[PDB]
């Protein structure tokens, strides 16, 4: 049976290579990658691929790989798809490890904006987990030269990671990774997938998709949120995306709110990630 080579960029930046039958569903590849990673809490994760417009798309595990990658390479990244609001409730330390790896990339890429102090805190927990107790015999030198902590490194940031690293003596790796996540989960952009859009009056906005719902940034403020509980139906038509909201108490009619996306593929991609979040993070 005819196999296609698959390459997967792992969260540590390394490459996993395997073959799958060309008619394979995404689940087949995802299962191989998660087995490679010893990952059992798979529900939070996914593979991404890049479409012909260079846009990030989730590989639907329930659909054929060939019908998603189409004319592109069988080239994927392993990513967190659903950021858990409380990482302490994950059952396995290794799940929390992979989530830390994703957040470290979210921070360095600048997708996850972060104060100086929180960049230093997060960096100090990572160094504690991976290097263990601070070596003071080092006293002023750069044993952290290989660690990337921020979109922009400064000497002051490096100094602050080191000062905080000294304070974590005796902390074990899972402990350090749990403290990393306790800080990161509180960041206002934690787990927020951002999409360029316009409102019904043509004003530039960003739509954020996350556990808590659909966020609208009408300025550079979170000027609004639609919690998944309020949302009855998500749809797209042409370059338009719509959310149908349940009637408020005593109100006669539902409401439908409409957004303009950059093109049709961008409207469909937003609809798909909203439906997925709405299902995964729905009130039960
Ligand atoms: C679009 C897609 C991605 C994530 N991966 C997909 C697999 N190839 C490498 C990039 N980033 O922008």
Swiss-Prot record:
It comes from the Eukaryota. Residues 4-284 form the FERM domain. It is found in: Cytoplasm, Cytoskeleton; Cell junction; Cell membrane; Cytoplasm. Expressed at high levels in brain, with lower levels in kidney, intestine, and testis. Detected in lung. Transmembrane segments: none annotated. Tumor suppressor that inhibits cell proliferation and promotes apoptosis. Modulates the activity of protein arginine N-methyltransferases, including PRMT3 and PRMT5. Interacts (via FERM domain) with CADM1. Interacts (via FERM domain) with PRMT3; the interaction is direct and inhibits the protein-arginine N-methyltransferase activity of PRMT3. Interacts with PRMT5. Interacts with PRMT6. This is Band 4.1-like protein 3. It comes from Homo sapiens (Human). The gene is EPB41L3.
